[PDB]
Amino acid sequence: EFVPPPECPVFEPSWEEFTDPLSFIGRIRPLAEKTGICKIRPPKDWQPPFACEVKSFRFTPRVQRLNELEAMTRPREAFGFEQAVREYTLQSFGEMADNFKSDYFNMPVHMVPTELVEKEFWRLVSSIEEDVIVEYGADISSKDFGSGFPVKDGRRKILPEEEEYALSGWNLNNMPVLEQSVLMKVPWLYVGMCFSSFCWHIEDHWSYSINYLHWGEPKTWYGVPSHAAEQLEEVMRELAPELFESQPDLLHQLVTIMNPNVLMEHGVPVYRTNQCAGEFVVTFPRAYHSGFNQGYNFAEAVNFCT
Ligand SMILES: CCN(/C=C/N(C)C)C(=O)CNCc1cc(C(=O)O)ccn1
Ligand SMILES: [Mn+2]
């Protein structure tokens, strides 16, 4: 079955090192740049409150058919109308997500080993006999219902115990986002359920990205260092569906799902991590990454510049 890639680096900075994100990322770069991704665990006392407007938080998630590329191998009757379209609140999405996972594995959602969800995910992606369909609240703009981090503005109220987090350099709203040049830049939200996923991609302009899991079950990641970017792209073209082979990268990476073991078999280095609630994941410039969610969770991401 699936062989898990080696673990990416995890850093546990002291309060002194936790002072400036860009200074810290600059210092860990000699190691983290060689794995493409790294995980950062903040000091134990660093616990930002969740600041989204939860009562009015409503969204229509995207439908994900795990084996859609494998099923390209007579089209189905009335294709394009498989799943009925559902709108959710945070609470009703969570109820759906937990019922899906507990029903799927026949055990309570917190008892399912992360290694089993991983093994099953990659089996389902390549399975022609079983068609599993899930939903992902992905790419929700933080301008919609606010950031998960507290921010200083007239939108909501900030308590004194909250203000340190509104002002923190690790608040994703306070990251630098303006690239220097001769002359949408806000965080985005992701409401996950078991098996919801993001396929292999790099960021626009080869940007760094930083990713925070506010709460919930882990987000499983795979990363490739930037020195292997060209090798991954060559493996993709060789093994991607012929109909998509000529597509430009920006469109191709909407459907570049590929088992990490296939890349490893072709000599591409791949690292993994389970990002748990309260942890950051940083992706380095031109570091390909992909992943999936273990269950109901809430993440926030932003592209930043150095
Ligand atoms: C900074 C967030 N962003 C910008 C998206 N807009 C184009 C809508 C990205 O493209 C980030 N890349 C997608 C992604 C999504 C996930 C996820 O679904 O958790 C993890 C890692 N990377
Ligand atoms: Mn990304």
What whole-number distance in Å separates Cα of residue 62 and Cα of residue 84? Answer: 11
Q: How many CB atoms lie within 10 A of CB 289?
A: 23
Rounded to 5 degrees, φ, ψ at 133 are -125, 130
Q: Which residues contact 113 (CB under 8 A, 6 or more apart)?
A: none
- Class assignment of domain 1-306? mainly beta
Q: Are 298 and 216 in contact (CB under 8 A)?
A: yes
What are 211's strand-pairing partners? 281, 301
Any idea which ligand is nearest the CA of 139? 1
Q: How many CB atoms lie within 10 A of CB 300?
A: 22
Among protein residues, the one with the nearest Cα to ligand 1's atom 9 is 203
Point out the ligand 1 atom lying closest to the alpha carbon of residue 139: 8
Rounded to 5 degrees, φ, ψ at 117 are -55, -45
Question: Is the shortest distance between the CB of 136 and ligand 1 below 6 Å?
Answer: no
Query: Which amino acids are annotated as binding site for 2-oxoglutarate, given as ranges?
Result: 136, 209, 211, 219
Among protein residues, the one with the nearest Cα to ligand 1's atom 5 is 139
What whole-number distance in Å separates Cα of residue 131 and Cα of residue 126? Answer: 10
- SS3 assignment for the chain: CCCCCCECCEECCCCCHHHCHHHHHHHHHHHHCCCCEEEECCCCCCCCCCCCCCCCCEECCEEEECCCCHHHCCCCCCCCCCCCCCCEEHHHHHHHHHHHHHHHHCCCHHHCCHHHHHHHHHHHHCCCCCCCEEEEEEEEEHHHHCCCCCCCCCCCCCCHHHHHHHHCCCCHHHCCCCCCCCCCCCCEEEEECCCCEEEEECCHHHCEEEEEEEEECCEEEEECCHHHHHHHHHHHHHHCCHHHCCCCHHHHCCCCCCCHHHHHHCCCCCEEEEECCCCEEEECCCCCEEEEECCCEEEEEEEECC
Could you tell me the distance, in angstroms and rounded to a whole number, from the CA of residue 74 to the centre of ligand 1? 34
Write down the residue that tokens 């991590």 correspond to: 273
Point out the ligand 1 atom lying closest to the alpha carbon of residue 293: 19
What whole-number distance in Å separates Cα of residue 101 and Cα of residue 112? Answer: 9
Could you tell me the distance, in angstroms and rounded to a whole number, from the CA of residue 201 to the centre of ligand 2? 7
What are 213's strand-pairing partners? 299
Give the mutation target among 8, 189, 196, 211 for probing the ligand 1 site: most ligand atoms within 8 A of CB: 211
Among protein residues, the one with the nearest Cα to ligand 1's atom 14 is 198
Neighbours of ion ligand 2 (CB under 5 A): 209
What whole-number distance in Å separates Cα of residue 246 and Cα of residue 269? Answer: 25
Q: How many residues does the chain have?
A: 306
Rounded to 5 degrees, φ, ψ at 251 are -90, -40
What whole-number distance in Å separates Cα of residue 290 and Cα of residue 65? Answer: 16
Among protein residues, the one with the nearest Cα to ligand 1's atom 15 is 198
Give the mutation target among 297, 303, 304 for probing the ligand 1 site: most ligand atoms within 8 A of CB: 303
Rounded to 5 degrees, φ, ψ at 2 are -65, 135
Q: How many CB atoms lie within 10 A of CB 266?
A: 13
What whole-number distance in Å separates Cα of residue 186 and Cα of residue 20? Answer: 20
Any idea which ligand is nearest the CA of 287? 2
Dihedral of the alpha carbons of 229, 283, 270, 295, in degrees to the nearest 10: -130
Cα Dmax for the chain = 62
Q: Are 149 and 172 in contact (CB under 8 A)?
A: yes
State CA 76 to chain mean position distance: 31
State CA 171 to chain mean position distance: 17
What whole-number distance in Å separates Cα of residue 174 and Cα of residue 151? Answer: 9
The sign of the dihedral angle between the CA atoms of 91, 94, 100, 103 is negative
Residue ranges covered by each domain of the chain: 1-306
List Cβ<8 Å contacts ≥24 apart for 96-105. 96/135, 96/193, 97/192, 97/193, 97/194, 97/295, 97/296, 98/295, 98/296, 100/134, 100/193, 100/194, 101/193, 101/194, 101/295, 101/296, 104/194
